Amino acid sequence: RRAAPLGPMPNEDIDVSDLERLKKYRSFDRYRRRAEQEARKPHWWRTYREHFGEESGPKDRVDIGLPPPKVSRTQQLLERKQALRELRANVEEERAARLQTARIPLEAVRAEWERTCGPYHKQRLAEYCGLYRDLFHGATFVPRVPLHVAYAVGEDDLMPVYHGNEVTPTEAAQAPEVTYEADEGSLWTLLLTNLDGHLLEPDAEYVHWLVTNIPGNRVTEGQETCPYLPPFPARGSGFHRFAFLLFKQDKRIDFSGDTRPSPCYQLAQRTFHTFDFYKKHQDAMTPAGLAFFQCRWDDSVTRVFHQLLDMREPVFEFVRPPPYHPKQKRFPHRQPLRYLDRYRDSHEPTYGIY
Amino acid sequence: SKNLGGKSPGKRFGIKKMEGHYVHAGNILATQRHFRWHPGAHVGLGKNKCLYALEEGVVRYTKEVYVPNPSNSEAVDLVTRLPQGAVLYKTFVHVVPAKPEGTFKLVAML
């Protein structure tokens, strides 16, 4: 019996006859590019991605964010070609290129990258780290405005907090300094949220630092809704995520239900849901800044648990499922002598009646 | 008479676990004499071309592109002699893991 194909076959387009006059590639890397291009297409047969979770394939993510800046395509292209021509006109650059001795302004390159295409890379890194899935579960935003966060770990020592960095709780004990370009006519809110680390509710998150009605860039001048709390990841479960969400708002938002008391050392009170927060205040604020770092347990987390939270430090461990063994047989045929040791409760000798 | 030695038992070279079967680690998914099924994710290859699951999960069979090892001279020659629009395809057997890697359990409050 035979069954008709349920769609186009892969190699049914090219002609079988007259192979000599048909062009061929002679390059393994060229074939590799072709094969990786083919492997990403939605074939009608069973594929690896379908079974191993392509995440429902394409998804129409809801964009809740600032519109992209409007630039003149023709003018931008003209200036870019002019810059390329003026660079190529040089001869010292040519000599350096041929002699393979030429350096790069890394700081500059980072500056223009963050200016023009940094938000998209940051958004895809947030997608990979799963921030949107746990903060809104259905929405994505592009961090249009850079947000530079830095902790002070000494008198001249500054720890930057990039997207996905690893920061020690000892380094993050103090409140950080945050900078972002903004005119003196807008209002901003900053939220530090602990995504993973809530002992009770898996789907909930903790608050650490909520400042609202920030005039432009001076965050210290704006009122703080939630006092800063240093990260306290558990000893067992490591590498928690802490996200800095920046919202730009038009009106002066005033609320009383989200306000926290001065001590604010109760984990029951410090229970948060960014989805609920954005649903409550969705009309005014729009997310425009993102800064998230990973954080693991260190020697200061126990002090934070004891002195501040006034509790006992919880300790976890990464346990593994017990090894699988088949049903024990009355007569295990051709099995090693150690077969009886696979079903032994303890390595001690029990004398039932003696 | 003139023909001798034609008697020899079958080697049972075939498929052991089909699609959807729940296998454990080390289970022989399929044995073969020549390369008929290729291993994929969480499927290891023995010295005798047999395929064994490396993780406990569900067996799946897929059709996927074939990029050979660049050190394999015969396969590289076949690829370089393939025409422009031709891509090789092979039947790969995969094991989709079911149980998680582990769990974080509380042991003591210190």
Binding site: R2, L6, P10, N11 | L82
Partner: peptide, 21 residues
């Protein structure tokens, strides 16, 4: 498999040949 719609997906000997008046 012969009875499946995906039979012959792995065929490649018709793409390469390896065996004037």
């Amino acid at each position: 498999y012969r009875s499946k719609p995906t039979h012959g997906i792995g065929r490649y000997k018709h793409l390469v040949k390896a065996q004037v008046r």
